[PDB]
Amino acid sequence: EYASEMNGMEIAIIGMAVRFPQSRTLHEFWHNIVQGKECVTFFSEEELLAEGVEQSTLDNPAYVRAKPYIEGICDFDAAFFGYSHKEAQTLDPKSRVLHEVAYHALEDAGYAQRTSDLITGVFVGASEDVDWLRRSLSQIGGDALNRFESGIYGHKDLLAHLIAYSLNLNGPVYSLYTSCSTSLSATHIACRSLLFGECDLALAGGITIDLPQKSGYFCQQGMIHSTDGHCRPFDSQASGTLFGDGAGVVVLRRLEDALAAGDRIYAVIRGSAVNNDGKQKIGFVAPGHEGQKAVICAACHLAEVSPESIGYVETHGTGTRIGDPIEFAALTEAFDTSHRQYCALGAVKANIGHTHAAAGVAGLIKTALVLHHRTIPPLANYQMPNSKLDLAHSPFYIPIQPQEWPASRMPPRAGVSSFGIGGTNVHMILEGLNPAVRDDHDQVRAPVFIPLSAPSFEQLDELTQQLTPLLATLDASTLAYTQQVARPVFDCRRVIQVENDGTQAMLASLDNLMPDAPWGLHCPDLRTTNDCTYAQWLAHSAHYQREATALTALLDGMNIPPAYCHAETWAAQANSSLLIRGCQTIAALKTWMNLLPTLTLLSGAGTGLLPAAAASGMIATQDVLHLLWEMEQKALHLWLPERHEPIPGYVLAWQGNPITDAQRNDRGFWSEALLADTRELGEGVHSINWVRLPPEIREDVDVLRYVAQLWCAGINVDWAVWYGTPLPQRGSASAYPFAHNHYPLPGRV
Template sequence: MSDRVAVVGMSIRAANVRNTADFWRLISTGRSGRQEISPEDLARRGVPERRYKNPAYVPVEFPMADALACDLRAFGFTRPEAELTDPQHRVMLEACYRAVESSGCFIGSLPDRVGVFLGSRTTDYGARIEYRSAAADRDLDTAGLAIGTDPDYMSSRISYAYGLTGPSMTVLTACSSSSVAVHLACQAILAGECDAALAGGVAVNVRDAGYLFAENGIYSPRGRCEPYTAAADGTVDGNGVAVLFLRRLDAALAAGNPILGVVTGTAVNNDGRERAGFTAPGVAGQTELIEEALDVAELSASAIGLLEGHGSGTRIGDALEIEAATQAFRSSGAEAGECRLHSVKANIGNLTAAAGAAGIIGSLLALKHGEIPPNAPLVAGGTPTDLRGTPFSLADRPTPWPRSDRGRYAAVSSFGLGGTNAHVVIGDAEREVRLAERKGRSWQLLPLSADDPERLAATVDAARETVAGATADTRRDIGHTLRTGRPQLTTRATALIPVDGSAADVRWPARERFHAAPEGPPALVFMLPGDDVPAPDAARALYEAEPVFRATVDDGLAVMEEVLAPETFAAVRDAFRHGASRQDGLADTPLTTRPVLHLLATGQHAFLADLGIGPDLLVGHGVGELTAARLSGVLSSEDAARAVCRRAQTLADAHEGAEAAVRFTRQMREVRLHAPTTPTLSSATGTWLTAEEACDPGYWGAQPGEPAAPDDAVRTLAAEHPGAVCLQLGGGTSLLRAARLAGAAEDTTLAVLPEGEAAPGHSLLRTVGDLWERGIRIDWDAYAERDHARRIDTLPREFDRTPCLHPVLQDHGPGTDPAERTGKQVGR
């Protein structure tokens, strides 16, 4: 078991930030999501005039978009349940989903025991619902309201919604909540209580529209959060959510997760009474905290290139924080000015319960991009605080942070009102992580799904854009991630993309080609033809492309070599290994086409079976009945191969008539026959093959020639299984045409190798995609045995953005933007 914890996924939303890419653009350019609110806008939001005209009122905000939005279906809510649920809890459901999704995994099917450690800001959402309901004399589900709004239930809601079975707890230590959550999550992973964990926090006030400041209070009278500057005069609350997905390092490496960083040390303490008052910070406690975290990480302070400080922006708080960090760093050998000091609070405001996780995400992004962001107030022309003689420096521009043999490390401080402090040290991923193995096919199958056609169309567009600029390795990563790390939603489409070559050659699915998968998988019918000759080189293309197909064909060829005449066997073999032989028309005779069809079908079946795709029903025509007998267990693979060769000879000697039938019957008495394990339709009787018929050599011997058509059998199939998906193995579409004439829908009749089409080696991959689109279950983990790569953050799920607010608050939510209450849009 590894003694280290990796960060493999993360998500963040805040002011002007919908994802980590937005967050990096914001902090790397030193911009801010702060907004000033005009009196007209305040009035439109229902803020009382007496409030916003108060001289102490500060009309600024750090708003998070779509704070009221909720995808009811995706997160398993009824609308009444969602209306009773604090928007913070709903936002957190999506944030946890996104954090896992960014690791290339689906939160609903994680194999590990996953813990949940989350913090939240206190809000009055539940209290206002209770008050307004009582005022309107409306009934209220008080138990549902408690579950939906009390912080006690936030983490356990996440565990329940996604089936996570590790430790689950809400962490409330004010502004250090999410950093303490990270500490607890790492401890749980290292203690073996769980293999992975979600850790973070949320701070969303849907009524945020400015505040009243008090003299000598913690809030800025200017409405500006400017940590570590001469003008710093207080903090400004922001709105946002930040979550990290942590996993034991060895497990993350084995799963191919992205390793965003490694947590090398964490520490938590409390100042006790060694401070001026309960709300005052303590230098001694902060100093001891940083020293302890560095000791756990086994690092000297000189190794820390970035200190993401608490940075509240208050004069006293910033000064005491710098003093404590200076003492801790000096005691560990740090030199003057060698560590950059930064705080994302200047960019997104003080996210309180989510602030620490936001700081960690900012630091991880700095490691990823090899650049330390500038201090936002300095970019805007602010004057830095005096750091002479300290180990720290500030900058008004990005600073390069290249990799080195010594590694790169960042440290993040979080100090909660009341004295609970946390410090987290993170470092680079290891060398072997960057050399992770990729192994895959030259074509990548992309399963794309969404909750409805509109969102699937957006996903297809995003996939086209992503693939266009991707390298060969990244295309493999995209394919692997979509196959093994995404939910299988109801509206589906697939695309095949070349690993090398132009993405312009890809046929992206148009909207009219989208499929709606049924709730349960439909019945799957394998149809086995007897006389459909595949296109030239079709057999060889599959033989060269797929090892499982090739191994099955080789086994069959080894048996057929004992039965067929040498020149006939050479033609059959050459159809797979050297290209079809056309000498003297030999390849177009039953002596060769029937064995080739049989080997094609059994090879295709083996490939599909390896992915967990098997027939619920079988129907064969002519020689195809013998192939069906092989797939249903009536005949062994060796006996089926011999029987097909003998049937081919019978067809070549059709002039012998009854004598040939007597000789087949006699030959079938020499093999062991079994009852079918898969229901099989008989083309001879048009009904289901019975155990007695299957075990009777006379049944098989009575078919020296080919039936004219399997019409009766196909009609039986269409009548009894109208919703079945029919797949013709081997080659051609003759049985599919019969099925369509009997009433089967064209959309549910598929062929591996349709006649008249080129037969590329990825025909089987296209078939897998066709089946998946129609609701057939695929074992994507088995697929990955042959085709795997890294898991990456790509093509996130499209969520619905419909606002959800309790009815009693629709007209009684001063501060909430009316557009946020009623608007609807679709977005990522």
């Protein structure tokens, strides 16, 4: 829950995906952040010569062989996003990488393929590097049609529109640029476009791929750059600024919609200000002290947040000698508080370098993870404060070792600053959420079931190997529920059972399974039997209880005695009646049609045929219920009801033979079936699949195991029917395994 006063300006971060340096996933990114490790990979001369960088530049001492690079520039799943191999070859690598990162952000949001009723805008940015321009334009142009298609597909300008076209997003799709605050500017436009209500979801956040991956950079004195290959923000050894690669996408909702839909929310963006320096600085690349102070004050006033209550600031933190004290003094002036050493500082550019179009979304994703985990990270590469940082009389301390959030700064509020080269300064105030009530004291909960699904079996193997650090990071219950309801399903399926001690047990396939057969559920004669089509196991399911309330409301005005009209009392008086057994079987079959929506046949022998017919809709419920009352006591003058047709996707059976619109008008075989009361099991051959549980069901999760084994077959099980009236909070499941085909870079000088 949020637990602060809700103005209208509240945007929730409901799912984030990264491809930062050494940070392929969000958990690897958080691991690098809380471990405080630099993600720059210093290379070797053989690696530079392999990537096409010549010894006449390797011998140059102002060429630092270091780059915070991204693995997987050339890998792309073309067919998943609707591309041909020729189209994916002509695509920019930024287009391919942000295709995958944006899909992973929708997946982490829980909206991977349920973007139909939601308007989703794509607000992404992209840096431009001249290296891709040299490679792509230096190739032979050929014809004019190919050149027009190459200018459409292979430029970063149409990045957002390609992402929207592949992911079928029909909101405000903009491709922004403000050159270092590009992705907090994109997040600001996303927040404003959501608060206006143009879109209901918003993908925000940029990408930089410096085409030559595994290369170095030319440090130079007139530039600002890291002279040694490390970025040291707010540090006495601040060498300069290290330009990494990166890609980050956040998915954003209004907090009212995100709380109503049960979305996991990392943090909420309370307010966001954007200004520009204009001429109020030294030059075009200079920082502006007053512009940064004004944007922090405007965002704090925006968020109705006093900077007393801010416990972390993700600074822009470029690691330069002169820009860091301007940023610190602007933060000190905007925090006109006279409270000393309470807010932490941070810079993600210590870890992943400057990212230049994903720098703002790097800071936003890092700050949302900081508020989500309530853990102040360490600021990497920091030992001594910069000599002109007046750190002692300031609001801000710098964390050297990871710590949890201070108790006297609650609710956790934090600020994300990204200040552009170009002058565009963005500040965002973010508030953390109160953590979820885990009512377990690490007691024995249940074996949970994680339904992995991939379009091919090797990707399913990638998923199953992905599940092990995922269970190392999260809890099994929310990961299981999120893979149940928030992930789209595909052909190749696999369920993993996870116990209290973490052991990933693959559920076995179903036996006696034949392909291309209808799915049926048969209920025996309820006069002799006791199981009311497994209704003692659906008694928790908050849908059986819903249909029990429905039959209670229908019965009140129908039947006299109290013991038949109280809900949730039917467990003890189950064997004491037949009307109770029929009502239990009605609600059980309704839940067994909600689950397994492709369960097509309904079957029933003896007096369970009236539950089968009333659930299927072939007979109305009224005459079934009071008819079942006289089968409870009278068994004389049965009244055969009206011939209704069932629910048109569904179909009835008697013992496996479908009694469907060929005999249904007859009074003969209905009364012959009902008055017989035989219960005899159904025949061996019906060429269909029976929903028949194993007889070792004693623990209320073996039924969930069985419907998981059903899901591992062709059934598209709707798992939300199963769960009780406290539904599980969602959280983050697996990321998609992409069928990584390889497209090389056409490199030419």
